Amino acid sequence: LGLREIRIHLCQRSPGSQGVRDFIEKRYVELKKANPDLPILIRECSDVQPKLWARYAFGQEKNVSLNNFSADQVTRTLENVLSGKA
Amino acid sequence: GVRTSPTGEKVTHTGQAYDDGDYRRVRFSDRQKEVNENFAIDLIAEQPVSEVGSRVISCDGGGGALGHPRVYINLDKETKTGTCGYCGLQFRQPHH
Amino acid sequence: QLIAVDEKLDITTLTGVPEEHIKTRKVRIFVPARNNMQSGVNNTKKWKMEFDTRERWENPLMGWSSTADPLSNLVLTFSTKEDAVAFAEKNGWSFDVEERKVPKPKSKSYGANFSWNKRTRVSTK
Amino acid sequence: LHHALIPHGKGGRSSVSGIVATVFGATGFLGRYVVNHLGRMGSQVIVPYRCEPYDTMHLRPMGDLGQIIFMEWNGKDKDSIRKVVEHSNVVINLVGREWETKNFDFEDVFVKIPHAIAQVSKEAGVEKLIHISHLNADIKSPSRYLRSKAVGEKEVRAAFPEATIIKPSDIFGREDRFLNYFASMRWFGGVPLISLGKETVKQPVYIVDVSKGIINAIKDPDAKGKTFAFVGPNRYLLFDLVQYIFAVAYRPFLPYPLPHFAYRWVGRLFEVSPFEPWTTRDKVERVHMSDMTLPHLPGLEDLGIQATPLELKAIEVLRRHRTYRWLTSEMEDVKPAKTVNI
Amino acid sequence: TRPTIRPRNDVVHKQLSAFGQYVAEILPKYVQQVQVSCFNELEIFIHPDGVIPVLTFLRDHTNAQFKSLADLTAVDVPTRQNRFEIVYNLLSLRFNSRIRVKTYTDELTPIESSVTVYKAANWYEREIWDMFGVFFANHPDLRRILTDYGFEGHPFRKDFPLSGYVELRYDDEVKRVVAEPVELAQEFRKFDLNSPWEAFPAYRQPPE
Amino acid sequence: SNIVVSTRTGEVMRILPRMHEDINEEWISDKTRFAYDGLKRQRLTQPMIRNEKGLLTYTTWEDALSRVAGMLQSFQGNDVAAIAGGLVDAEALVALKDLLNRVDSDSLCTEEVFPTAGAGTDLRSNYLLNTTIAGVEEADVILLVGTNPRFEAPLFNARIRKSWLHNDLKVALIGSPVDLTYRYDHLGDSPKILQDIASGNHPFSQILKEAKKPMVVLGSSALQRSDGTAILAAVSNIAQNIRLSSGVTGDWKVMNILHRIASQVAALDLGYKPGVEAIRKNPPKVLFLLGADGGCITRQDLPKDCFIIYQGHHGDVGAPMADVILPGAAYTEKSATYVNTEGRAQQTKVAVTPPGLAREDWKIIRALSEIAGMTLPYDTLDQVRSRLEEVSPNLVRYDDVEGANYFQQANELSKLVNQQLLADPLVPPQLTIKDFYMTDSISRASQTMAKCVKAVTEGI
Amino acid sequence: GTSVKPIFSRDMNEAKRRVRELYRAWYREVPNTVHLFQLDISVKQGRDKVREMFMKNAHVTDPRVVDLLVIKGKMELEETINVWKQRTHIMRFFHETEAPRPTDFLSKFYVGHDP
């Protein structure tokens, strides 16, 4: 229930990652200034698919696919994870 | 130059000797440990240094074709003796 | 006539190899690196397949080096990477492939040893 | 743990197990199995022998090069024991005799020798001692052999407090004196049994189980000062056991009752042999005595061993006692005997 | 050039080349290649399906009469899609000549047995089956010849280890010879011997 | 550097270079070549515990693992912490991170300090050598800040000298005037100069403005002082002014960070907290020392009766202070992942097996997790590398060095904290050659390195 | 098509038929092997061992591989029937002198480095 880290795996030039890329290019910084003590690790995937990882207390974590999402979709799912839902 | 160890085991020329805690010593009970008594390092240290009147000397180990490959030794360093890389014999130039 | 099998080649059941030395082994497929002590390149032409290193221990009686794995000395030669990959796949071994390393072409100029205004001029010959 | 004694290898012939074991009485029945099991995994085995070296030859192939070392010893000489236990981390005592010789009696072989072994091993710094006693050892036992066993186990415990004592019961095997002893009684035509063997209960145990139990006790850190009881999985009335032995050997069974004093007289008569006696009065008493039940002591199952029943291993011992006509008979033919279990 | 160098014979080279052309002309259905080595040995590379015809021709032809099978063995080259190379050495006493016939197979493709042509083949094929695992169809009695009973694997394959997988000893508990995984007190020491400098320019391969 | 390990009959005989045009290309440094000697002494071979007298005594794996597991089940959260040393591999790092996460602990730290304000470890390009080692051959101006590339990264300095000799590269240094084996311009040693180049009030700012392929390299050793964050911010401001005045030259990646510790980049990729400050602020009761021998935290910084566990391969600073010793494998004794200062992930291979009873480090952590009741999912090396791919997918691409650049976001996040610089000259930890030979646990145990130190301190 | 030629069987059905014939022959032979070699095992043990060997190669889906396996099994049966094998050869199927090796991670971690 207690979020500890966020991991975003986005591919460098795959089309399906484009929206995710856009998000990092536009609205990552604001998020970082909203949660200045929260690890948001941005890493690169191989040719498979985008992914978002959310880790919680005591080692529990789950992942949500960000394939073909736009920037609005990734913002929506991210603020869904940061809030006490889903 | 064979010396003894604290347990009484003879020390080889390579310096091998079992420690007190080592169990392998049991292999020498009722038998003996084979040690060669002629330490080559002391024997080659016993040989006198040859004095020659040239900057370069040649060594083949003695006996011609029954020795080692023939090598040439430089004797320019005054504060050192030239040593054969095969035989261990030492050569120098007359000094003082 | 022919039967037109549509399976993947798999001969592990016929090679006599024990199961442990099939599933737990990792083979490496690579072009050996040139020995840095020499300039010759004739030993960097073929592909090699070799097995992962296992335990070696000292023999109690003479202090010799003792092993328990039978594949410690097995090295295979191949003309191409694809051939080695096919052999490893049909023998059931999981493999790691390393791409060939080729020295890049270099621009050599003996005249540059005596440049009028560059740093490449040599202070000794 | 003394780097040279760190285990290495895969546990095979050329491996290093980290065990340096001195096995007294290694040229006997249990000794060959114990030495073979130690040499299988690459242990350094020290064999003290008093017999002719020709009688130790069968132990030579049991170890890799240098892993089995033979040395002379005297049971009445402390310096021999010192010499053969100076370097071992495990000492196993399998010394025993079923009869008394002119030079060694039961008190010599079951009390004095085990006590000397335990004391010298404790002084030498040996950390593990395995001592073999009998399941029926009793200070008030009619048999001389059993009483000395009990006294010797007490003295061994006194000398080496952290010793592991193992008490088996009537080990059977290819070279045993249990199944062979009853099979060889066909030469007299009939089998004399005290009270027809209907008031004796036996719980025989397989030899390989005992050897594996000794090995596991060596490798068990919890078995330091423990006392174990190695017994088989089934209990048999003596009559039924002997009937089964004769059925597996396909020999005619002719049991007849002999009074105790007459059997004692026969044992007296056979004791006079200067060679190995065919039977002795003490042996007769032991055969007719029921096996004890000691549920408070740990057993083979506490060492990870499932006890092998006699029904799966009798043929490998008793096939030698068959005639040519019955030599090829399979093991599942001879209708296993009845057990008085619970 | 004279004393230390082996002399070459050109008459035999010409004759062997002519006979290779002859055999290739007569059997275009199976002959893939013909070669004459520079020490005057003639080889013919054929499709596997022509093992029986070609050999029969060489055995019974009036101009060939290769009536003796000197040797039959296999060579294992793992880098090839067809792993195994089958080699027949034939001798003609009438014309005092020798010929070599080569074909190929893999692990799962049978080769027709040539026992009907040469009796001597009977054991040789068995050996090839034992050491390499190549199956021969219509063999009168095909089974292991060299290895121990129940031996697993084919030891002459390149990927088979030199010391094998199992070793034998006598066990006193079971009173019999038993087999266990190999353990060596001294591991065999692999030597890396090849020089990094090329020895024979005449055999240099194109740099691909 | 890519190397070839020569071994005979189970013994490491020597170390030779292996050609990699992008990294070292034919050479190795003297420490890399002659430090193999150290591995043969001061080695941990058996598990150790504390006896009744407070002395370290050999024990079995079961006993030590049981003691550690009981101590770990006793506590939870901030009471558990770990410190990763300079030679740790990625597999063991991720295993320890998962194990401490199961206890709900996030105090996973490294000895090497990296600034955490702003972007921190969130963006990889913030802590990488983005130009790569090969890219030095294309630059025309390189600025060196608070670093001694000769001893921190000898092959990187060799590449700089190659560029200086063949491409007429221009080199300027801010820091102490060290000898770099090539002529360079010395701007000074005060950090104020950085601001002078960031404000445009320096001639070298003009020089960088007309540089079409400029590079700025900041050493990790300069980030170890209290004002490392301000230094990083100033260097980021300089890179910003370069990118703004000169425009965007495509993909050149002016910003660069030069690391000196082999384990740092993988630990940052996995989410380890750089520095040891979190341990200082919340002193734990159970501390894990994963090959940590820098002496950054002693028992004075920790409460009394604190349980300290050391896992490593050498007896050094960290072992005598530990309650339990877990002997691990050296880099020659395992197949393990290490990430470059470039960001390139590479793997070692087993040459010899670990001595005595020592084991693979990730295997030790997994066995401990199973003993303690929180069993980790992975059982083989391939499964641990699958977990590594789960946490950071660049750790399984074994020669890739290309990555995205997020300099704009990191720079924007770096200008909201305005801490001030210190009036202390930038002094590299290694000023001369004598401070080069002994830096880590293996080289400190080497007799050859001791001979080299004795030879350089006195000729004779 | 992949253009491959058969050994004996055209597809998996004929291969399974040959497997069943070989299994029948081995099952019939087991009691004779127990009698002739004077084995201390039971007939049930021998038939279970026979069943175990067949199950090991159950996964194979290629008819040529199955054909070769059947050929090898027939060779082994011929060796057994003619008493070319000895008692040691028959008992090698049972691995009676090999100490058991645990498959758990902890047991392997304790003993050594091998995976």
Ligand SMILES: NC(=O)C1=CN([C@@H]2O[C@H](COP(=O)(O)OP(=O)(O)OC[C@H]3O[C@@H](n4cnc5c(N)ncnc54)[C@H](OP(=O)(O)O)[C@@H]3O)[C@@H](O)[C@H]2O)C=CC1
């Ligand atoms: N077999 C059984 O039924 C079970 C055995 N017992 C105990 O198990 C132990 C071993 O049994 P087991 O193998 O059948 O006995 P064995 O008769 O087969 O051999 C006993 C060993 O002790 C040695 N030994 C005997 N007397 C002396 C002596 N005076 N001096 C030196 N060595 C001597 C023998 O050596 P040498 O050949 O030179 O005479 C021999 O090696 C014994 O202690 C026995 O009491 C436990 C329950 C019953």
Ligand SMILES: [Zn+2]
């Ligand atoms: Zn000489």
